[PDB]
Amino acid sequence: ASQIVSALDVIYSPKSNNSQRQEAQKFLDEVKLCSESPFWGYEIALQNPTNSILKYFGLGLLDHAVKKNWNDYDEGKRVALRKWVMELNFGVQDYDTRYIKEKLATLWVEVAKRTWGEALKQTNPTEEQLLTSWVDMDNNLFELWNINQSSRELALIIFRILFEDVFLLDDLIVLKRMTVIQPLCVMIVCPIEVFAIKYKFSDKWTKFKANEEGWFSVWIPELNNALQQNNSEYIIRLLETLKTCLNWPLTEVIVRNDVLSSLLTCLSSNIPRAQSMALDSIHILLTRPYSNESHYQMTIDRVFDNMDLLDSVYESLLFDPTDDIDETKYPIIKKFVDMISCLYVCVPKIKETNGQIQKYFKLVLKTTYNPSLIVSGLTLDLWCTCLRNDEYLPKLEKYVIPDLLQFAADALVYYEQIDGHISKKFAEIDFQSKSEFQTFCSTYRKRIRDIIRLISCVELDLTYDWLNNRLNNYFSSPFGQQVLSSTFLDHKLEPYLGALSQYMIVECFINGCIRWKIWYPTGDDYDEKLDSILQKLEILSNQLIALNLREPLLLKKQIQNFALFLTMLKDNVLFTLLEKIITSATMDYPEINLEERGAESDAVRDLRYACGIELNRMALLMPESLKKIYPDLESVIARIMPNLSYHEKISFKSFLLIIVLKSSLDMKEERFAAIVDPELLAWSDKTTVVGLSDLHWFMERLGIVQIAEYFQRRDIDENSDLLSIPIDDEGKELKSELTKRWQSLFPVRATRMFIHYSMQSIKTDEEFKMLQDLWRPRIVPILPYITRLLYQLQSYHDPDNWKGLPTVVQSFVKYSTIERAMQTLRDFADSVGHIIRYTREYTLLVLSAISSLGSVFYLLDESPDLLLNSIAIFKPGSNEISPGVSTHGWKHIMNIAIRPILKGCPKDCLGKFMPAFLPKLFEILDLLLCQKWSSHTEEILEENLLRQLTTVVVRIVIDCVNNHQMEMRKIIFNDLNTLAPFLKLLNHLISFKDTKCSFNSILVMKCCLTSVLNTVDEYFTFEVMKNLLSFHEALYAFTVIFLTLCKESARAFLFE
Amino acid sequence: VPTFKLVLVGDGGTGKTTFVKRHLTGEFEKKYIATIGVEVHPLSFYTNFGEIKFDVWDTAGLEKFGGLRDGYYINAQCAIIMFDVTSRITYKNVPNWHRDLVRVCENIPIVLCGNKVDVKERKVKAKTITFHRKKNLQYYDISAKSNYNFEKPFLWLARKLAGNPQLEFV
């Protein structure tokens, strides 16, 4: 009686050590485990009304007793516990803290869940059975409702907890008792006659109901009376209890008491908690299931008839975010907007008689203007859905679309990059990271662009009239004048961002015009409308081009918008726009040097690169359209060629080539030769042809000899730290000279562009053969040179090769080999290494494209030898494979050349290519992978690279063992020369550390074991079994091998 | 000097005790010892406007060991709900912890912390976390193994308690 109080004081005293608290807790737990714990708890709760902590502990004892030992107690003890709980509940007073009343309600509900109504499971239960089932619970609750004000709050807590557990929460006890609990809860609240309508239950149930009129007829009058008296706390309590008893009850109760009117009245009141709970309750009423649809119609009509009230509530909730966001109303604003955004589903069911729908859409639009993006983002999905569905489209067309369009246009900005934008104030509250805000802004702008795209698709004429007005006003504004005057904007300040937003709006309009072709019914009027749309687009394009905009990034966006245009226009109007695209994009910029790698020159280089992509894509899509315009495009390109570098010269030549091939122009062979031969002619140059076999000649052409001269002139010591030594003008000049020399010396990019686009869009087998006859005369002659070039780049990484190189540059070239603007000599060496890697990747891509030519490359007898001997690089004495070449280099080699070159085999040529290629390839791969694994942050990165290489090798094996694998298995398994290296490769793969590689290799072995076991047997017995000796299947394969090998010295060797 | 009673609640093994310890000392314990009862730890912070102290009542996260499973929340002035991102059962229990946490202390600020974010495999993806915005709780992604945001919850609680959003640790 006093030890418990002292222990509680120890537990709650801030001055007690954790050991003292733990000792006191041990004592209290001992008390809790006693047989008569509940009676002591009841005594403590009764006799200590002033001590809140001690009373709560007593109630906790009771709660543990009922909640953890209920099964143990007999009926007498259960009735005693119920009586004690009721006695404690009826004794509630004004001095009981809130958490005491919560605990008392918890006790009451815990007893009720386990004892209320269980007698009803029987038929005509006796008086004793009813009493054991708490037949009087409802009568007691009604009695508890009148004792005093404190008890009335307690009854509300009891109801809240009961209905929350029974219906909202997935409590287990009520899960078992559902069939008799849920009907009982509905019974007490619903009027008796209303209850009889839905349920057919007999009279015995009537004994469990005290108030014939139900409970709603008690709460709702109380709620209205509290609203009249403006009793905030009582209103909040009633809403808390009332918020949990709206989803489940019979709808007739909701309508009869007019709950929704009370909820709206609560909403009008300026009590934040009451408003929030009223919004939650209204949403529950809207989304809850309705058995009778007339009541649902009444509910939605009642909500929509009060759009003025909802607008007033929203206006009240609004606040100024400039100083500080009101955290007591911002959540309520989000709740309100979320509830509003769900109403639009009910629009078609409402007969507009007082402008309800117009007011609703105006309110939704007004909420969309909210400074917070999250608040706005709630309604964005509403606008997209409404525009797509023609059910609402007639209503939007009148009210909002004119204003929604203006909002969407004004809101298509880069919020994060603006200085002190009002939206960012809410960002730090709703998001805990900058990245979160950036991604949400990206999504928000995407959804906004959806709105503008759909508004222009539907109201195309209105949008176009609005668009021209917007563009004319903008480009006359001072910012527009700055944009049209400047040549390089800051890409972060207002002029550029505004212009970019304008061009995004234009892009959205063009996308809408494109969608209109699909959206508009294909009626008789379709052609006239489409011609008008095309004329409007032409006029807009002529308008935009006339501005003579020079800013590259803006000029790239304009070019891409016109690329969208061109999918529709045709004939001469197409050419007038395409020529202006070509000339404007490729216009020179005397104000800047196009080789300094400055941030303002990379913009121009990207601009010129964007056109190549767009022009090539457009040519691929619409070659027939460009057929008759080609005579003029050829002249335009010729006129523009002089002011283009090699890199873009190739792109525009590729555009012309695509038009020539895919458009069905006459004399294709002549034009093809005129375009291609001048570029590929560099391969056949006698100097390059002869010197490409000499490593030293390769070094000199790369310019390393000149670098040695430069280092000597600057007296750069062989060990001098190039990491810090600065680069000078002469260094940049030499680097530019070498790069310009290098690209034209080995036109790998030109070859890969011409071959790739040539074979891009084959339509018929005849066209494929025609192209083969077109590339064969000029690809086979150069294949030795291409493979030699790949050979040199491969041997360039071998340290011994540069041994004869001058010592001063020995460190420079070594830096170049190392993998992973330029201002230091170390960066110069890194850039040279980048040049080497770039040439190595493109020469691989040239080989893959030559593979695409099919029989031209595969059926050639020497191709396997050339390719492998050019990638192998076998040292004279040592068995090293391509010494000094990075593992990443091998990964790229395999992935980009060998896989395409293998999978790309023609099924009629596997009989001539694979036999002379698989043996050597397998030996090389085995030798390489064993060497890489023989050696086994920087080390972790190397491990990961080796894992990736092994994965690629396995993929090659998997892709070799469907239509293709069917023939490849036959080819491999019928030749020992190919099988034995393949078995070696499998044996090496299975044993490697990586788990996935071993697992997949074991699967492969299981797949083909039956076809191979037929000196293969000797190798299996001696190496495969020994090496093997994923786990279970590996053992399964081992046993499968054994069952035959040792069944047919093998067993003795295995035992050894 | 103010002193706010803070109750830290969450499923056992979620890192409540580790988080409290690492705020007491730099050490990041790795061995797991299930707290039994409650651990009271006076934790102090220095801010531009002065000093604040949180009596961090670290509650046991296991039913077998929670002595006064709810009595610890009595007179609490703020609370923190810790759930393990790597384990989705803990997040599933967050509504339960909030439910029986608001029963005792009603209007106190509550912070939901997703602990152990350092690992490469988090079963509770951020996309699946919506309880905090449902109950208007302030949510954070923290790890007492990386000190990713360890101090954020206390800063938010200090701002709410002192009614001084400009308050900042120094």
Ligand SMILES: Nc1nc2c(ncn2[C@@H]2O[C@H](COP(=O)(O)OP(=O)(O)OP(=O)(O)O)[C@@H](O)[C@H]2O)c(=O)[nH]1
């Ligand atoms: N990866 C990772 N693991 C952590 C981190 N913090 C704690 N852990 C691990 O999680 C365990 C949590 O230990 P405790 O904090 O003592 O356990 P608790 O959270 O108090 O749970 P209870 O004691 O049962 O209430 C520790 O043993 C750590 O091994 C973290 O920041 N990152």
Ligand SMILES: [Mg+2]
């Ligand atoms: Mg603990």
